[PDB]
Amino acid sequence: MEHVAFGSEDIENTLAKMDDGQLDGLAFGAIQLDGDGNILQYNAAEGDITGRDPKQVIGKNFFKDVAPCTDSPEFYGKFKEGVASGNLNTMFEYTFDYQMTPTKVKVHMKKALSGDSYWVFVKRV
Ligand SMILES: *C(=O)/C=C\c1ccc(O)cc1
C-alpha cells in the first residue's frame, strides 16, 4: 500500500510523484482528468468500485463516454467551473449507477499541481 489518507490537505503534492503503478497502491479510487474531462489516469481501486477496466478507459471522456451519471450540475457542473476558475477543491457524496449496482461514494475533486490536470478521488461510504 501507498500510505496517503483520503482528503489529506497536501494530497496533490504527494500524488505528484506517483506513476500508474504507484497509483494502483492507493486505498481509494483515483482518476486524473485533463481540462476537457478526458481520462489521463485511472487506478485499480476505482476499477474495483465501478467494474471498469483501467486500461480500457484511459483516453476516453469521463463525462460523455464513461460516466454519464456524473453529467449533471452536481458533479460535471462543479468540475467545469473549477476548470474555468483554475481552482477546485470540493468534497461531496454521490451515487454511481450507470451499468452497475447503485453505489454510494464520497467524491473529492482537486486541482493537481500541474497546470491543466484534475484529480477525482473516490471511496465507499
Ligand atoms: C456515474 O458515476 C456513472 C458511472 C461511473 C463509471 C466509472 C467511474 O469511474 C465513475 C462513475
Tab-separated table of C-alpha atoms and ligand atoms in Angstrom:
chain	number	residue	atom	x	y	z
A	1	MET	CA	0.000	0.000	0.000
A	2	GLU	CA	0.903	3.634	-0.562
A	3	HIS	CA	0.094	5.463	2.683
A	4	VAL	CA	-1.962	8.539	1.813
A	5	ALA	CA	-5.262	9.364	3.523
A	6	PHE	CA	-8.353	10.275	1.553
A	7	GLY	CA	-8.997	14.023	1.922
A	8	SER	CA	-5.454	14.899	3.021
A	9	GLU	CA	-4.707	18.631	2.663
A	10	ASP	CA	-1.476	18.174	0.728
A	11	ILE	CA	-2.689	15.268	-1.399
A	12	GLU	CA	-1.761	16.875	-4.734
A	13	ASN	CA	1.925	17.126	-3.737
A	14	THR	CA	2.100	13.509	-2.648
A	15	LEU	CA	0.419	12.132	-5.772
A	16	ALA	CA	2.716	14.195	-7.991
A	17	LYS	CA	5.482	11.585	-7.556
A	18	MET	CA	3.368	8.514	-8.389
A	19	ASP	CA	3.303	6.587	-11.678
A	20	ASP	CA	0.321	4.477	-12.774
A	21	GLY	CA	1.881	1.595	-10.846
A	22	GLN	CA	2.041	3.501	-7.579
A	23	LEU	CA	-1.426	4.966	-8.094
A	24	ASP	CA	-2.692	1.379	-8.056
A	25	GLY	CA	-1.480	1.097	-4.495
A	26	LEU	CA	-3.863	3.691	-3.073
A	27	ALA	CA	-6.614	2.827	-0.561
A	28	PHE	CA	-9.126	4.772	-2.638
A	29	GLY	CA	-10.151	5.446	-6.220
A	30	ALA	CA	-8.122	7.973	-8.155
A	31	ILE	CA	-8.815	9.406	-11.603
A	32	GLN	CA	-6.821	12.113	-13.293
A	33	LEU	CA	-8.584	14.223	-15.905
A	34	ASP	CA	-7.450	16.921	-18.275
A	35	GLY	CA	-9.420	20.181	-18.594
A	36	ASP	CA	-11.800	18.630	-21.123
A	37	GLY	CA	-12.650	15.676	-18.909
A	38	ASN	CA	-10.512	13.165	-20.752
A	39	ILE	CA	-9.109	10.386	-18.586
A	40	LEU	CA	-5.306	10.534	-18.194
A	41	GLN	CA	-5.063	8.044	-15.299
A	42	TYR	CA	-7.456	5.597	-13.629
A	43	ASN	CA	-6.377	3.340	-10.780
A	44	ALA	CA	-7.163	-0.211	-9.672
A	45	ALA	CA	-9.232	0.892	-6.694
A	46	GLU	CA	-11.593	2.908	-8.896
A	47	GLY	CA	-11.843	-0.169	-11.113
A	48	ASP	CA	-12.827	-2.181	-8.048
A	49	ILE	CA	-15.646	0.226	-7.212
A	50	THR	CA	-17.055	0.675	-10.735
A	51	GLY	CA	-16.170	-2.503	-12.619
A	52	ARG	CA	-14.340	-0.609	-15.356
A	53	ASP	CA	-11.016	-1.950	-16.655
A	54	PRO	CA	-8.470	0.846	-16.066
A	55	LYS	CA	-6.532	0.259	-19.291
A	56	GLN	CA	-9.694	0.443	-21.347
A	57	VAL	CA	-10.957	3.801	-20.094
A	58	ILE	CA	-7.753	5.842	-20.416
A	59	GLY	CA	-8.179	8.268	-23.310
A	60	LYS	CA	-11.971	8.365	-23.146
A	61	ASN	CA	-14.068	11.248	-21.907
A	62	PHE	CA	-15.317	10.735	-18.353
A	63	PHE	CA	-18.454	12.870	-18.624
A	64	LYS	CA	-19.606	11.902	-22.106
A	65	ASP	CA	-18.498	8.284	-22.533
A	66	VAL	CA	-17.545	6.509	-19.338
A	67	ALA	CA	-19.540	8.105	-16.505
A	68	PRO	CA	-22.616	9.858	-17.912
A	69	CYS	CA	-24.240	9.666	-14.497
A	70	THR	CA	-21.788	12.403	-13.423
A	71	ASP	CA	-23.058	14.657	-16.248
A	72	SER	CA	-25.110	16.988	-14.086
A	73	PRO	CA	-24.720	20.312	-12.284
A	74	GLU	CA	-23.895	18.436	-9.070
A	75	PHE	CA	-20.763	16.807	-10.473
A	76	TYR	CA	-19.757	17.878	-14.014
A	77	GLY	CA	-21.116	21.347	-13.229
A	78	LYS	CA	-18.611	21.683	-10.374
A	79	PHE	CA	-15.733	20.336	-12.458
A	80	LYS	CA	-16.320	22.762	-15.322
A	81	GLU	CA	-16.489	25.797	-13.029
A	82	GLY	CA	-13.265	24.670	-11.342
A	83	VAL	CA	-11.518	24.310	-14.691
A	84	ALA	CA	-12.730	27.726	-15.785
A	85	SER	CA	-11.597	29.279	-12.462
A	86	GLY	CA	-8.347	27.312	-12.361
A	87	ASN	CA	-9.140	26.414	-8.775
A	88	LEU	CA	-11.014	23.382	-7.487
A	89	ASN	CA	-11.384	21.654	-4.106
A	90	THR	CA	-14.731	20.101	-3.271
A	91	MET	CA	-15.999	17.027	-1.477
A	92	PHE	CA	-19.499	15.573	-1.747
A	93	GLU	CA	-21.374	12.266	-1.641
A	94	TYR	CA	-22.807	10.846	-4.845
A	95	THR	CA	-24.342	7.680	-6.194
A	96	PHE	CA	-22.646	5.867	-9.084
A	97	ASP	CA	-25.337	3.984	-11.077
A	98	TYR	CA	-24.543	3.664	-14.779
A	99	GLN	CA	-24.399	-0.006	-15.864
A	100	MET	CA	-23.649	-1.063	-12.284
A	101	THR	CA	-25.352	-1.671	-8.934
A	102	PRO	CA	-26.053	1.748	-7.384
A	103	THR	CA	-23.124	2.516	-5.112
A	104	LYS	CA	-22.867	5.434	-2.730
A	105	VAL	CA	-19.447	7.053	-2.608
A	106	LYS	CA	-17.622	10.089	-1.311
A	107	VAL	CA	-16.006	12.147	-4.054
A	108	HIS	CA	-13.186	14.649	-3.642
A	109	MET	CA	-12.189	16.725	-6.666
A	110	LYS	CA	-8.987	18.731	-6.549
A	111	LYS	CA	-6.807	20.602	-8.995
A	112	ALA	CA	-3.483	18.874	-9.463
A	113	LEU	CA	-0.091	20.526	-9.076
A	114	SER	CA	0.460	20.503	-12.860
A	115	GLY	CA	-1.157	23.199	-14.998
A	116	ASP	CA	-4.180	21.617	-16.644
A	117	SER	CA	-4.970	18.416	-14.772
A	118	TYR	CA	-7.537	17.486	-12.152
A	119	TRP	CA	-7.974	14.681	-9.666
A	120	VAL	CA	-11.147	12.843	-8.803
A	121	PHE	CA	-10.805	10.728	-5.647
A	122	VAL	CA	-13.430	8.201	-4.633
A	123	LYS	CA	-14.168	5.960	-1.668
A	124	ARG	CA	-17.088	3.883	-0.460
A	125	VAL	CA	-19.326	5.226	2.298
B	1	LIG	C1	-21.900	7.537	-12.522
B	1	LIG	O1	-20.998	7.785	-11.720
B	1	LIG	C2	-21.715	6.693	-13.618
B	1	LIG	C3	-20.572	5.934	-13.966
B	1	LIG	C4	-19.243	5.841	-13.491
B	1	LIG	C5	-18.361	4.995	-14.184
B	1	LIG	C6	-16.997	4.905	-13.879
B	1	LIG	C7	-16.471	5.700	-12.870
B	1	LIG	O2	-15.254	5.649	-12.596
B	1	LIG	C8	-17.332	6.559	-12.185
B	1	LIG	C9	-18.702	6.644	-12.485
